C-alpha cells in the first residue's frame, strides 16, 4: 500500500519477524513493512507439530494456544495484532513501527531501482530489503501423477490451516499415513500416534531411509529412534519408496516399489522443503547450485541493499563453510543477523544455531553445528541402551557438530567445543565435560 518504505521485509515468518525485531531494537523509529503472502500474522511453526497436538483444551484448534515448559502458556503468534500497525499509517506514526501486508505476494523485484511489485499491481520503493520467503513443502511425484482425488486427500503440512485440516481429519478418519521420516514426518507421526492411542485408530509412517532422522542421526541412533517411534503407537515402515498412489474402494492406496500396499484414508506428505526463490529470476539474484536458496555471503548479504535470512538463505559460515539451515532457531538468529547488517552493523555468522526434537517421552535431543549422518561420528553413552549420551561429528579430527542425546543444559559446553577447533585426538575426555551421569 505505501509507495516508499525504509525497511521492507518480503515474507511473513520467523526470520522476517526476528529481523524486524532486531531492526526496531537497534534502530528506534525505523519503518519496517512486512509483506506476507498469507493472511495470518507471523507465527511460530514448531507448536503446530509438537505442542498443539498434546493440548488438553478441546478447542485448541480455534485459539491456537499452548503451554510451554514452565507454568505459563502462550499463543502460537509471535505478537498479538495490537503489536503491528497498519501499512497506511506506517509512514506517519511517530517512532516508526512494524506493519504486515497480509495476503499480498511480492511477484516482481527490481534491484537497480530498489522497487517491488505486488500481485495486485501495487509498487513499493525500499531502501533496505530482506528476502525471508522461507520455503514451501515439496510434493511427491506419485501424488502429482495420481490425479485430483488423491491431491484432495493429501496434506502438505506447513501452515495453521494445514494443522486445522489435519486435526479435523484425524478426529474424523481412522487411518493416516505419514510420508517422510525426517523432522516433520517423525514429529507428526508421534503426535498422531498419541492421538490414535487416545482414540483407537491407525497411524502409519513410511520413508526410504533405514530409520527415523536417517540424514541427521547415525544408523544405530536411527534404529533406536525408529524403535521408540514404533512403540509410540506408529506402524513405522522403513525402506519404503512410493511409486504409485491411487484411490481404491473409496480409500487411498499407497503402492511401494518393493511390492507393499498401504491402505489409508488420508496422506500427509513431509518430503522436504523447497526454498522460495521465485524473486531471484526477476531480481537477478544468484541461486546456490548445491544447497538451494539465495546465495549470500558471511553477512547474509546478496546485493548492495538486499539481504536473505531463514530457510531461503544459503550463507557462508567461516568456521563450517557454506550452509543452509531450515530450523526455527536458525531462522531467529539469521533474521537477527540480517536485521543487524541491514542497520549498518557488518558482522558475519558467528553465533552457531541449534535445533531440537522430541520424538516421544524417551527421545529428546539437541544438536549444534554440522549435524549430518554422512560425517564420521563418535558416540559416548552412559553405562544397546542409547538412553543418554553425546555424539560428535568430525570433518578430519575437529568437532563440527554435536548431538546432545537426552542430556539437557549441556549446550554451552558443546558450543564452546565447536567454537574452538582443537583437533581432539581422544574423544572420551571431551565427552567427560558433559556430565552424562
Amino acid at each position: 500500500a505505501p509507495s516508499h518504505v525504509p525497511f521492507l521485509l518480503i515474507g511473513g515468518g520467523t526470520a522476517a519477524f526476528a529481523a524486524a525485531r532486531s531492526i526496531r531494537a537497534r534502530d528506534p523509529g525505523a519503518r519496517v513493512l512486512i509483506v506476507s503472502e498469507d493472511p495470518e500474522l507471523p507465527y511460530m511453526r514448531p507448536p503446530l507439530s509438537k505442542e498443539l497436538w498434546f493440548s488438553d483444551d478441546p478447542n485448541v484448534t480455534k485459539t491456537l494456544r499452548f503451554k510451554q515448559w514452565n507454568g505459563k502458556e502462550r499463543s502460537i503468534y509471535f505478537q498479538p495484532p495490537s503489536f503491528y500497525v497498519s501499512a497506511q499509517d506506517l509512514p506517519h506514526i511517530e517512532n516508526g513501527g512494524v506493519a504486515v501486508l497480509t495476503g499480498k505476494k511480492v511477484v516482481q523485484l527490481d534491484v537497480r531501482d530498489n522497487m517491488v511489485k505486488l500481485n495486485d499491481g501495487s509498487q513499493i520503493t525500499y531502501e533496505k530489503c530482506l528476502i525471508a520467503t522461507g520455503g514451501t513443502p515439496r510434493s511427491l511425484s506419485a501424488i502429482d501423477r495420481a490425479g485430483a482425488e488423491v491431491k484432495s486427500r493429501t496434506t502438505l503440512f506447513r501452515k495453521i490451516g494445514d494443522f486445522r485440516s489435519l486435526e479435523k481429519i484425524s478426529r474424523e478418519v481412522k487411518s493416516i499415513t505419514i510420508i517422510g521420516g525426517g523432522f516433520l514426518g517423525s514429529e507428526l507421526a508421534c503426535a498422531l500416534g498419541r492421538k490414535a492411542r487416545a482414540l483407537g485408530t491407525e497411524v502409519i509412517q513410511l520413508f526410504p531411509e533405514k530409520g527415523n532422522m536417517g540424514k541427521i542421526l547415525p544408523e544405530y541412533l536411527s534404529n533406536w529412534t525408529m524403535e521408540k517411534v514404533r512403540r509410540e503407537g506408529v506402524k513405522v515402515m522403513p525402506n519404503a519408496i512410493v511409486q504409485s498412489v491411487g484411490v481404491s474402494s473409496g480409500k487411498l492406496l499407497i503402492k511401494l516399489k518393493d511390492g507393499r500396499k498401504v491402505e489409508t484414508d488420508h496422506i500427509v506428505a513431509a518430503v522436504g522443503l523447497e526454498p522460495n526463490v521465485e524473486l531471484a529470476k526477476t531480481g537477478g539474484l544468484e541461486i546456490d547450485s548445491d544447497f538451494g536458496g539465495f546465495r549470500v555471503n558471511a553477512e547474509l548479504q546478496a546485493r548492495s541493499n538486499i539481504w536473505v535470512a531463514g530457510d531461503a538463505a544459503c550463507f557462508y559460515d567461516i568456521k563450517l563453510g557454506r550452509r543452509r539451515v531450515e530450523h526455527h532457531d536458525h531462522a531467529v538468529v539469521s533474521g537477527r543477523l540480517a536485521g543487524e547488517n541491514m542497520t549498518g552493523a557488518a558482522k558475519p555468522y558467528w553465533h552457531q544455531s541449534m535445533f531440537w526434537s522430541d520424538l516421544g517421552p524417551d527421545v529428546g535431543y539437541e544438536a549444534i553445528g554440522l549435524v549430518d549422518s554422512s560425517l564420521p561420528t563418535v558416540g559416548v553413552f552412559a553405562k544397546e541402551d542409547y538412553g543418554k549420551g553425546v555424539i560428535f561429528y568430525l570433518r578430519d579430527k575437529v568437532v563440527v557438530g554435536i548431538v546432545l542425546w537426552n542430556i539437557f543444559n549441556r549446550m554451552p559446553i558443546a558450543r564452546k567445543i565447536i567454537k574452538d577447533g582443537e583437533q581432539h585426538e581422544d574423544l572420551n575426555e571431551v565427552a567427560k565435560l558433559f556430565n552424562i551421569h
Binding site: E219, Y220, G379, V380, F381, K383, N428
Partner: peptide, 19 residues
C-alpha cells in the same frame, strides 16, 4: 566400558566410574 566401530561410527560405552 568398551569401544565399538561400525564403519565411520564409533560407539563408546562408559560407566559412572569413568566420569
Amino acid at each position: 566400558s568398551y569401544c565399538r566401530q561400525e564403519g565411520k561410527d564409533r560407539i563408546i560405552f562408559v560407566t559412572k566410574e569413568d566420569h
